[PDB]
Amino acid sequence: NDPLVVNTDKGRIRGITVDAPSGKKVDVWLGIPYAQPPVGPLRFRHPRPAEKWTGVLNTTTPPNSCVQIVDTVFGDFPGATMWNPNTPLSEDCLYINVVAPRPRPKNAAVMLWIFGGSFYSGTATLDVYDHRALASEENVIVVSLQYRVASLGFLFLGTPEAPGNAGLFDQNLALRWVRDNIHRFGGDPSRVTLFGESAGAVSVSLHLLSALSRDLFQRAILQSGSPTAPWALVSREEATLRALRLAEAVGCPHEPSKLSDAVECLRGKDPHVLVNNEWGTLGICEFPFVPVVDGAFLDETPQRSLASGRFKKTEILTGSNTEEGYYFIIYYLTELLRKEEGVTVTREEFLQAVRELNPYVNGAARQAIVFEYTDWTEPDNPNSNRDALDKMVGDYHFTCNVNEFAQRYAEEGNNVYMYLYTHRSKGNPWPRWTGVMHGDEINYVFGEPLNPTLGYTEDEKDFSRKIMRYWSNFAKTGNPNPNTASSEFPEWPKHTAHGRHYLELGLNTSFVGRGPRLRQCAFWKKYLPQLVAATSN
Amino acid sequence: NDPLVVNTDKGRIRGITVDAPSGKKVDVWLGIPYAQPPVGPLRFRHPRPAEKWTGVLNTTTPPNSCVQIVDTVFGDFPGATMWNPNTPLSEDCLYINVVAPRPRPKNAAVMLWIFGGSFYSGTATLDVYDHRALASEENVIVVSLQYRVASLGFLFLGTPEAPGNAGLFDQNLALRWVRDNIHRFGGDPSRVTLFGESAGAVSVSLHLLSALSRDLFQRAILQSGSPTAPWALVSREEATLRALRLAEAVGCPHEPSKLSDAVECLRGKDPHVLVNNEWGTLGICEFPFVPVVDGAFLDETPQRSLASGRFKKTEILTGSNTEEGYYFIIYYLTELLRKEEGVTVTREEFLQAVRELNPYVNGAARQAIVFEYTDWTEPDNPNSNRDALDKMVGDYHFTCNVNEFAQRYAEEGNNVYMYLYTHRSKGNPWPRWTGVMHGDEINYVFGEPLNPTLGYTEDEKDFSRKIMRYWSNFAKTGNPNPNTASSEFPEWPKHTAHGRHYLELGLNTSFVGRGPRLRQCAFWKKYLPQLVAATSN
Ligand SMILES: *[C@](O)(c1cnn(C(CC)CC)c1)C(F)F
Ligand SMILES: *[C@](O)(c1cnn(C(CC)CC)c1)C(F)F
Ligand SMILES: *[C@@H]1O[C@H](CO)[C@@H](O)[C@H](O)[C@H]1NC(C)=O
Ligand SMILES: *[C@@H]1O[C@H](CO)[C@@H](O)[C@H](O)[C@H]1NC(C)=O
Numbered sequence A, B: 001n002d003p004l005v006v007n008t009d010k011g012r013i014r015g016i017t018v019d020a021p022s023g024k025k026v027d028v029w030l031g032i033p034y035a036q037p038p039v040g041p042l043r044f045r046h047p048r049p050a051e052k053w054t055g056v057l058n059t060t061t062p063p064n065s066c067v068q069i070v071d072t073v074f075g076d077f078p079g080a081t082m083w084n085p086n087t088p089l090s091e092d093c094l095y096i097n098v099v100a101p102r103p104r105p106k107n108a109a110v111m112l113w114i115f116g117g118s119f120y121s122g123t124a125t126l127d128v129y130d131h132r133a134l135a136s137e138e139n140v141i142v143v144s145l146q147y148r149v150a151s152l153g154f155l156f157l158g159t160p161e162a163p164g165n166a167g168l169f170d171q172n173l174a175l176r177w178v179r180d181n182i183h184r185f186g187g188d189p190s191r192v193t194l195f196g197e198s199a200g201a202v203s204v205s206l207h208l209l210s211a212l213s214r215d216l217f218q219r220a221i222l223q224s225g226s227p228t229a230p231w232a233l234v235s236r237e238e239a240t241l242r243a244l245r246l247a248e249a250v251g252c253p254h255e256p257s258k259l260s261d262a263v264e265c266l267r268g269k270d271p272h273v274l275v276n277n278e279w280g281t282l283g284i285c286e287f288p289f290v291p292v293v294d295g296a297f298l299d300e301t302p303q304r305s306l307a308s309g310r311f312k313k314t315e316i317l318t319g320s321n322t323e324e325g326y327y328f329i330i331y332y333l334t335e336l337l338r339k340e341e342g343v344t345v346t347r348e349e350f351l352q353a354v355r356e357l358n359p360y361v362n363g364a365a366r367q368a369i370v371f372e373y374t375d376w377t378e379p380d381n382p383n384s385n386r387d388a389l390d391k392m393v394g395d396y397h398f399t400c401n402v403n404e405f406a407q408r409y410a411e412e413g414n415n416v417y418m419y420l421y422t423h424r425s426k427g428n429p430w431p432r433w434t435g436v437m438h439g440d441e442i443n444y445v446f447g448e449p450l451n452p453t454l455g456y457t458e459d460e461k462d463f464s465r466k467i468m469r470y471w472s473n474f475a476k477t478g479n480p481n482p483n484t485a486s487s488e489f490p491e492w493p494k495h496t497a498h499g500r501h502y503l504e505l506g507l508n509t510s511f512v513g514r515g516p517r518l519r520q521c522a523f524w525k526k527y528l529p530q531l532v533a534a535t536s537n
């Protein structure tokens, strides 16, 4: 009997044994189908489960990537190409990958990754997500899934043929596949931890809300993403207009009264033409096709679920990086924050950037933003004015929403663990002033430093082991801390509703603070909303 | 020849040799007259110089205190009685005191004290201002003066018989006495340092502006007071109304069209009746009779003098205490901050106090104050909400105005030295939660801890020696620092226009910071004014 052949509920599949960069071996099944290819009449619609197959399906090749724009702003710059699809683009992209340790466990914990990329880009096949180190160093089953992105995943028109949230229904079906099958690979289907970063963390958090996902997993890890972020959802009314704008841009009928004509034309267009025409006039951290409240995956806004306690009762581990904003500013204000060493921002340039980065608020609100994000020890310092741009974008779009989500989870009696990730890799290829950007922790979570052919220092290898241990301790037990307190593994205290402690994740540190950034988060969540109310005569 | 007999430009006077509390001996001349008694028809009017006398005037008794209200709110509480007059009250109060070291110097530096008390109270004769320790420990001539306070010193009606600023003309006349006479006591009249606290510091700063005082002294020390403070001046129009309200309250004619009738009745009233009827409906840190812009002592507001550079070019030493607000809140919100141990403030009480303590600003401004003065780590903490009250009163009325004055001076090329005084005496009789209040540094500046009948620790005696040494070094040279760097005398760096360094004055500390409190001061001086303008349709 061949242990690399596995009989799934739809047929048999064949995997392959491979090496970790770690020296240990793992078994691997790449490209398991979990839905019918969502092509032809099935475009924009919810996935159908996969049809049974006879024989043994060879699942040994990384699957196709879902159709998406390719980023060429910086050419072959490694900081950018690491996030571009590394497998062929196709609408036939609904696949799962499974990676098991050796020897195969019986009832191991299962860590299921959901990638980010602003709901219009990303793929489970990226080298930075390679599953082998995490599985073999921590003895967990590691799973990843594809889901449709961009208008192909999130077109909404309020009609049955464009119902919204297709990409979320994709993730739900993959979750169902895992519960029905992961025990055949040595995983315990009652010990599934979802983890994701960015739009993948939003996705995870939406599974903490949906009644369709409630019983499909055990706990959740959310890296730099929360469902209260202003980019995480779009109203149904605005989604309908963006879809019609897309129909216009590609030459289709676009009348609000005959939505049948628009969907049918859109189903005939080339998929690359669709994703390449989504980009109208949108501000920073505004993505055109994202989740909506549809009635079935969600039937109320996340903030209404949070206010009422209608969310899954379980532990969560979540956090932010210190420079969440720069990445998006680098791609949005391409004249101001050039990708070069030694960039600084003048006070006059800062005052203009504030208007460009918060284009919807009135003058009085802009003044408050300026006051809140000025270094009053040295108001004109050109480093301070550059950093202030990162902090106002990162606080509003990322950090403060993570805080809000963790706070409501803790108030309802759930164990919460909060981190602030502060480590900058020695080999970071971005300019020195960018600090610790959005996404930097992913390399350490997946154990890339344990690949000796990359350039990581010995200390960074140790740091990556610590982080994989915290993450997988959390997946296995609900608590990232080990049993015997260690000098290498500082105590990570709970994030309580009143205390709001967080652990700083970095090389030479075990600092525990509160928040992070409680005062700036109160500015966005409490002060600025009431000032906008008072001044909207 | 009798060294205690001195021939002043108006006659001979006889002093007396006495011991400082430490046992060192000083020569002393108490109660030297420098003006005609401002009585009868001379009430409210500028002082006339004193008439010559034949003989030897014995100047050995502490002089009368100017008429003022006596504070009985807390009975015999020593924290309050230390500020009440300790000599008989009289309108005949225009006197100077001189205290010289032994042996007598030839050309010593002269430190000239101007007392505070909100321009309605105070006297040079208070035991806490006793001059003997400072003169004898530091080898300086110490001079103090009386000046008229309250309506007797600052009544203004815009007529020649109530022209305003009588108390300021009193101080100026005393300055002219010191320049004409102090060399006969061993002082160098080209080495007069003015120093003052609170309203005495405002007074000092106004001598830095007035053309009448410009050549009368060399440099200035300003403890917790600045001419840009909101209580430091009153408009001419509002002063006129307050004078007319006082005339009504005591039964006098009060018609804006016949001011002669109002002044003449006021001149016939008992002086105690006048000072006891000044207190209408005024908010915290609002004092009824204070300096005005008169045309002769000042002919433009202090902020216009500062903006244009029209002020004396010289060194200044200035600073603030950590709890500037509490003293005034204790006397204003007598139900909320009872003078007991263990006082705290609830969030609901804090929100009400913000309105009572800033009664002139609109809804949007109060919101901003609340946001600026909330501890967002723990918004409802009853200690944090009490401390927030001190800080918002202290920032607006004291600390931020000292910062503004020191900043202007430094921008114009003058050497500035800034302190933050943080020492709470072991024997402080106020409740523990009051911290380091307004006025606390005065005991140490005058060397009270060196009095062996009092209860100060040895550490406090050393601290007082240090503070006297800085103050007198500054008077002697313009620099508080000694020549040989010491372990007991940390470096006190200049407060430059862009560095804004300050030295923390405390027991076991030499911390150097910036500001202090630059962010909160920017809130009051920059953000809140532009928010008030935007929201007053
Ligand atoms: C989130 O999905 C996101 C966008 N880019 N990233 C990383 C790697 C995918 C690189 C910054 C995450 C988006 F912010 F919502
Ligand atoms: C200032 O003159 C003042 C009022 N009281 N004090 C001290 C000692 C006189 C006691 C707190 C100073 C006033 F604030 F303007
Ligand atoms: C699957 O792999 C086996 C060898 O392991 C091979 O013989 C077979 O042809 C493969 N199937 C397909 C469809 O290529
Ligand atoms: C870690 O921090 C301590 C704190 O002073 C320091 O002494 C030590 O050298 C640091 N090690 C580093 C930065 O590698």
Ligand SMILES: *[C@@H]1O[C@H](CO)[C@@H](O)[C@H](O)[C@H]1NC(C)=O
Pocket: B056, B057, B058
């Ligand atoms: C002043 O002092 C002397 C004693 O030294 C005394 O004789 C004289 O009477 C006193 N009084 C006056 C008014 O001079």
Ligand SMILES: [Cl-]
Pocket: A309, A310, A311, A312
């Ligand atoms: Cl629920």
